[PDB]
Write an enzyme that holds these catalytic residues in place. Structure first.
Site, PDB file in Angstrom:
ATOM      1  N   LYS A  64      -7.959   4.912  -7.895  1.00 44.54           N
ATOM      2  CA  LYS A  64      -8.839   4.995  -6.998  1.00 44.54           C
ATOM      3  C   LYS A  64      -9.710   5.655  -6.934  1.00 44.54           C
ATOM      4  O   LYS A  64     -10.744   6.424  -6.664  1.00 44.54           O
ATOM      5  CB  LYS A  64      -8.628   6.536  -6.255  1.00 44.54           C
ATOM      6  N   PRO A  69     -21.789   3.815  -8.537  1.00 49.32           N
ATOM      7  CA  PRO A  69     -21.723   2.634  -9.466  1.00 49.32           C
ATOM      8  C   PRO A  69     -22.112   2.920 -10.624  1.00 49.32           C
ATOM      9  O   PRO A  69     -21.486   1.870 -11.471  1.00 49.32           O
ATOM     10  CB  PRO A  69     -23.188   1.674  -8.552  1.00 49.32           C
ATOM     11  N   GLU A  70     -22.464   3.213 -11.524  1.00 52.59           N
ATOM     12  CA  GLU A  70     -22.427   2.895 -12.952  1.00 52.59           C
ATOM     13  C   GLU A  70     -21.218   3.734 -14.079  1.00 52.59           C
ATOM     14  O   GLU A  70     -21.304   3.319 -14.297  1.00 52.59           O
ATOM     15  CB  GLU A  70     -24.084   4.327 -13.613  1.00 52.59           C
ATOM     16  N   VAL A 174       6.002   4.299   2.071  1.00 47.45           N
ATOM     17  CA  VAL A 174       7.026   3.231   2.534  1.00 47.45           C
ATOM     18  C   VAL A 174       8.032   4.321   2.009  1.00 47.45           C
ATOM     19  O   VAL A 174       8.459   4.854   0.304  1.00 47.45           O
ATOM     20  CB  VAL A 174       7.151   2.117   1.524  1.00 47.45           C
ATOM     21  N   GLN A 177       7.051   8.496   2.012  1.00 44.21           N
ATOM     22  CA  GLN A 177       6.506   9.364   3.436  1.00 44.21           C
ATOM     23  C   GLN A 177       6.334   8.984   4.458  1.00 44.21           C
ATOM     24  O   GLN A 177       6.186   9.193   5.594  1.00 44.21           O
ATOM     25  CB  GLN A 177       4.946   8.181   3.449  1.00 44.21           C
ATOM     26  N   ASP A 180       8.592   2.691   6.728  1.00 47.12           N
ATOM     27  CA  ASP A 180       9.767   1.623   7.206  1.00 47.12           C
ATOM     28  C   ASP A 180       9.247   0.515   6.145  1.00 47.12           C
ATOM     29  O   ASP A 180       8.355  -0.207   7.181  1.00 47.12           O
ATOM     30  CB  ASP A 180       9.742   1.360   8.309  1.00 47.12           C
ATOM     31  N   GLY A 194       7.273   4.083  -4.327  1.00 48.00           N
ATOM     32  CA  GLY A 194       7.657   5.174  -5.330  1.00 48.00           C
ATOM     33  C   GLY A 194       8.937   5.882  -5.558  1.00 48.00           C
ATOM     34  O   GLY A 194      10.190   5.696  -5.788  1.00 48.00           O
ATOM     35  N   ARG A 195       8.447   6.597  -5.191  1.00 43.07           N
ATOM     36  CA  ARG A 195       9.656   8.004  -5.097  1.00 43.07           C
ATOM     37  C   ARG A 195      10.799   7.374  -4.447  1.00 43.07           C
ATOM     38  O   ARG A 195      12.125   7.349  -5.516  1.00 43.07           O
ATOM     39  CB  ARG A 195       9.359   9.670  -4.385  1.00 43.07           C
TER      40      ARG A 195
END
Ligand SMILES: O=c1cnn([C@@H]2O[C@H](COP(=O)(O)O)[C@@H](O)[C@H]2O)c(=O)[nH]1
Ligand SMILES: O=c1cnn([C@@H]2O[C@H](COP(=O)(O)O)[C@@H](O)[C@H]2O)c(=O)[nH]1
Lengths: 217, 218
Positions: A64, A69-70, A174, A177, A180, A194-195
């Site tokens: 994320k 920028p730097e 999916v 959360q 589908d 994930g989970r």
């Protein structure tokens, strides 16, 4: 990017032993693993090389990226140095911050995935209203990989419309959360899970079940 | 609120462990609060936080700009505080639930959350600026006490200070390399964040000393 079974495993377990064991149990079903900060901050960046050594899988760093920028440039360099094939970057911080990531990716032969709208409830507060514009910004910048919400198929469809059929789109949210698998794949090239897999009593059966549900896709 | 020595926080974004340690050690007599971000952490590991604590008697702010869903945000905060960070910087644009997740972990672990409202770079004007006042309002409503605002936009930093009130703690980056002035920024922020102007200088200690001299009356 050819994602096996159109399924990307979000490996957010925070224990090296469990992360490697669970990934190993579902390795026959995937060839693309997404590693984020939960695992990296708990075990270190060397875990990426370990995954490639053991599974020979593609690695997406879900970091994320959302700095100036730097700093974004430095983050991308450290990430690709660790062996990541792609990195997920937030679009909300603006065009210059995204361009910083694109530059490093180009230099190291990697891909940048632009996150346009998130899948959690809070995304409705500020991100959703800027999502279409963030997507257009991606198009203007030449971004070819995007991330959109499984939890809002109408929004995911809109994202697909903006970026076109040629662009690559992956989608989280999916399972746990509420998204589908099949409906999400009407618009996304691959789903992120994930989970529903790594917290399942039997991860292998969970993965096999999801794949069975999208067999015709 | 944390007592930041000389109202100056070092943004240690060097990616080499030896250089990061050398520079931080050289300015320790002037700064007791160091901000460690991903450039250094992704290059040397989370143990670098522990090493800084061991080597220097400095507080550590993890500038991780946490910006994920609630579930993941909680994990990031937990791992970061477990490593020894006194506080963590979290993005407000992902919404209230994401910020609340961080606050919950900070509360349970006895640490602090800093809410990043508006950023100091040019790109911040595209989407963040327009949502910044509300993000700040949201923070106040959620009980956030620590904030981050841009030194590059005095008018915006002033407005953010008004929104959060005089009791809230505000730190501000963008000083030096990005164009912000130390003194002007301290009219509104409790402390200024300085990275490159110090760590890229031939004599970081002299650079830090110079900045402090310019704000001595403050
Ligand atoms: O908009 C979103 C929502 N989730 N994720 C990530 O995708 C995964 C979703 O995991 P889950 O299947 O366990 O919900 C996690 O790694 C989470 O950080 C994103 O990148 N963006
Ligand atoms: O809005 C901003 C701008 N910068 N920074 C951070 O503050 C430091 C600024 O460094 P500099 O003095 O070298 O510009 C870097 O760590 C950068 O990621 C923020 O957290 N927020």
């Amino acid at each position: 990017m050819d994602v096996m079974n159109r399924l990307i495993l979000a490996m957010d377990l925070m224990n090296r032993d469990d992360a490697l064991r669970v990934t190993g149990e579902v390795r026959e079903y995937i060839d693309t693993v997404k590693i984020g900060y939960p695992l990296v901050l708990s075990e270190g960046m060397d875990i990426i090389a370990e995954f490639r050594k053991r599974f020979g899988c593609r690695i997406i760093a879900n970091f994320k990226v959302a700095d100036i920028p730097e700093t974004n440039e430095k983050i991308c360099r450290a990430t690709f140095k660790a062996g990541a094939d792609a990195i997920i970057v937030h679009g909300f911080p603006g065009a210059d911050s995204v361009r910083a990531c694109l530059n490093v990716a180009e230099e190291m032969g990697r891909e940048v995935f632009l996150l346009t709208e998130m899948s959690h409830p809070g995304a409705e507060m500020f991100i959703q209203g800027a999502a279409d514009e963030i997507a257009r910004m991606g198009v203007d910048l030449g971004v070819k990989n995007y991330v959109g919400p499984s939890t809002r198929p109408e929004r995911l469809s809109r994202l697909r419309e903006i970026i076109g059929q040629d662009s690559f789109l992956i989608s989280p949210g999916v399972g746990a959360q509420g998204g589908d698998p099949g409906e999400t794949l009407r618009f996304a090239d691959a789903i992120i899970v994930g989970r529903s897999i790594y917290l399942a009593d039997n991860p292998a059966a969970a993965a096999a079940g999801i794949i069975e549900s999208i067999k015709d896709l």
